[PDB]
């Protein structure tokens, strides 16, 4: 179920069926003329994968490394402090760094919260999701939630991929994910494969085969300047997906390191520059 | 976009492609033999409507009244006390009534919380969603959230239809909804049409045409005993959807009463008994 087939199956749709944000006074803008940059969009689109292969673009390179790195920060480290993410070599967050170093009450800070009761002892979303999966697989409640109505005003930025719903059906683990928004041009390919990594990880530790991987986008859009450039990507060549490796010797979620993930034989397209926009 | 066409388009799929919960020790059971009742299910299904008609079953009657009544309780009254819902004639909640009368920190209690900052003055989810829609339509954040990770342990029951995402595109208001679970046999038809009512209501008060209505289900299932009975419903006749009425003289969300809603010329099927199950 190549990520490519579905990816371009959604792009043209947006160029052809998308609605321009025009009618409004957007705040975001390019960087070569300050001229407010404008987009086209569609509501509610969905990408599903049977897991016979890694969902990753092959008509362009993805930040597969920076992607898994940011994953450990949010779900493994459950940290909101940017320094931790700077320690991994990633800086793409430096922009929302608060005078104290963190991004406020969002992302990792939501998962680390010891808010659930588990055998006369409080625990956090990630720890709760873990135990229940192997002691309450049938449960129709396996849900992580980033969108906290209580601390929304306290986060330095509103999350995109904010929730997930897992299912344990027939020795299989299914992962559904949802984004309230998503840039198909610079945000989607990175997020997708990234949250699919997280799936393979818990899958291995809980000892359950991988089920379907489903990714849900609410507002899907692309910027205008990015269109002419996406059309080429569509016609670009399509190679076979790589073979992501993950040390099988690991048996604990918090044992994984950026050194246990290796994408093998990853053929992808060439450099494609997509104009910057504040 | 009759609700019927899509409804049965999902039922057979479940009978044919659904997976039995069997493998597990379910807690829920029938009531004629205590024998644990069992189901079949599918993950991630979706129902969309263009709003040319009311999404309501015509091969069976829906609690269209009890449905809108429960809607005012959660979103209008933002109450968690069962007495209020008993005052409307509804008792279908009496089961989860706590020693104090309420269902804990769930449903209405989540929407009434004055947790957002609006012009140097705190306000609740419902009040926030309202103002922003007419002063920040373009916003990609219009979201209500019932799933509170902080008070989950405090609710007397985990919510099904827990969130919503609205969009204001071209004088149109689009409403996306999601359920973590949903019984296609006794829960779905009621929920769907119900959250579509809520849409028509804010639509009228904000003064925006209705956009697409999208309903998302995570775990969709039906109980075994209910199968033989759903097959008949499928072959039942299909009449044209009714013409829901709503007093146009209203201009405030909190002015609506169960007396402003009238389904006109509603042709539906006959009585279909679906075995009870604790």
UniProtKB/Swiss-Prot annotation, chains A, B:
PROSITE patterns: THYMIDYLATE_SYNTHASE (PS00091). Gene3D superfamilies: Thymidylate synthase/dCMP hydroxymethylase domain (3.30.572.10). Transmembrane segments: none annotated. Thermostable. Active at 46 degrees Celsius. It catalyses: dUMP + (6R)-5,10-methylene-5,6,7,8-tetrahydrofolate = 7,8-dihydrofolate + dTMP. Its EC number is 2.1.1.45. Pfam families: Thymidylat_synt. CDD domains: TS_Pyrimidine_HMase. DUMP binds at residues 140-141, 180-183, 191, 221-223. It is found in: Cytoplasm. (6R)-5,10-methylene-5,6,7,8-tetrahydrofolate binds at residues 183, 277. It comes from the Bacteria. One of its GO terms (biological process) is dTMP biosynthetic process. Keywords: Cytoplasm, Methyltransferase, Nucleotide biosynthesis, Transferase. Its main location: cytoplasm. The active site is at 160 (nucleophile). One of its GO terms (cellular component) is cytosol. Pathway: Pyrimidine metabolism; dTTP biosynthesis. InterPro entries: Thymidate_synth/dCMP_Mease, Thymidate_synth/dCMP_Mease_dom, Thymidate_synth/dCMP_Mease_sf, Thymidylate_synthase, Thymidylate_synthase_AS. GO terms for molecular function: thymidylate synthase activity. B.subtilis strain 168 possesses two thymidylate synthases, a major form ThyA and a minor form ThyB. Belongs to the thymidylate synthase family. Bacterial-type ThyA subfamily. Catalyzes the reductive methylation of 2'-deoxyuridine-5'-monophosphate (dUMP) to 2'-deoxythymidine-5'-monophosphate (dTMP) while utilizing 5,10-methylenetetrahydrofolate (mTHF) as the methyl donor and reductant in the reaction, yielding dihydrofolate (DHF) as a by-product. This enzymatic reaction provides an intracellular de novo source of dTMP, an essential precursor for DNA biosynthesis. Homodimer. This is Thymidylate synthase 1. It comes from Bacillus subtilis (strain 168). The gene is thyA1.
């Amino acid at each position: 179920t190549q990520f490519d087939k579905q990816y371009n199956s959604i792009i043209k749709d947006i160029i052809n069926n998308g609605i321009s944000d025009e009618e409004f006074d957007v705040r975001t803008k390019w960087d070569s003329d300050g001229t407010p940059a404008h987009t086209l969009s569609v509501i509610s689109k969905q990408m599903r994968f049977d897991n016979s292969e890694v969902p990753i673009l092959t008509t362009k390179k993805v930040a597969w490394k920076t992607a898994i790195k940011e994953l450990l920060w949010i779900w493994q480290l459950k940290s909101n402090d940017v320094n931790d993410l700077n320690m991994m070599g990633v800086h793409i967050w430096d922009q929302w760094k608060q005078e104290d170093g963190t991004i406020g009450h969002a992302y990792g800070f939501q998962l680390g919260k010891k808010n659930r009761s588990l055998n006369g002892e409080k625990v956090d979303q990630v720890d709760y999701l873990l135990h229940q999966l192997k002691n309450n697989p049938s449960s129709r409640r396996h849900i992580t939630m980033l969108w906290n109505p209580d601390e929304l005003d306290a986060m330095a930025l509103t999350p995109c991929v904010y929730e997930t719903q897992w299912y344990v059906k027939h020795g299989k683990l299914h992962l559904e994910v949802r984004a309230r928004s998503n840039d198909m041009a610079l945000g989607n390919p990175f997020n997708v494969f990234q949250y699919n990594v997280l799936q393979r990880m818990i899958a291995q530790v809980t000892g359950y085969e991988l089920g379907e991987y489903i990714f849900n986008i609410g507002d899907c859009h692309v910027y205008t300047r990015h269109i002419d450039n996406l059309k080429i990507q569509m016609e670009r060549e399509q190679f076979e997906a790589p073979e992501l490796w993950i040390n099988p010797e690991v048996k604990d979620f918090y044992d994984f390191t950026i050194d246990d993930f290796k994408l093998i034989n990853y053929k992808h397209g060439d450099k494609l520059l997509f104009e910057v926009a504040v």
